[PDB]
């Protein structure tokens, strides 16, 4: 970790972005549906330059 530095951090707060969007929306139902979806999405290809989008040691 410390021994090998990184030029940039790969972990865009898109989920936080979606959450903020959901908060702004008056619709409660949409807010809840989007909250779980966005929360569940977490890591996505759109928010990462690499098209592979590989993540998670377990799978």
UniProtKB/Swiss-Prot annotation:
Disulfide bonding pattern of the chain: none
Expression induction: Repressed by water stress.
Highest taxon in the source lineage: Eukaryota
Family, as annotated: Belongs to the 7S seed storage protein family.
Stated name of the protein: Allergen Ara h 1, clone P41B
Species this chain originates from: Arachis hypogaea
């Amino acid at each position: 970790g410390k021994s090998s530095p990184y030029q940039k951090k790969t972990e865009n707060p898109c989920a936080q972005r979606c959450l903020q969007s959901c908060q702004q929306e008056p619709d409660d139902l949409k807010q809840k549906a989007c909250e779980s979806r966005c929360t569940k999405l977490e890591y996505d290809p759109r928010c990462v330059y690499d098209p592979r989008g590989h993540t998670g040691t377990t799978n």
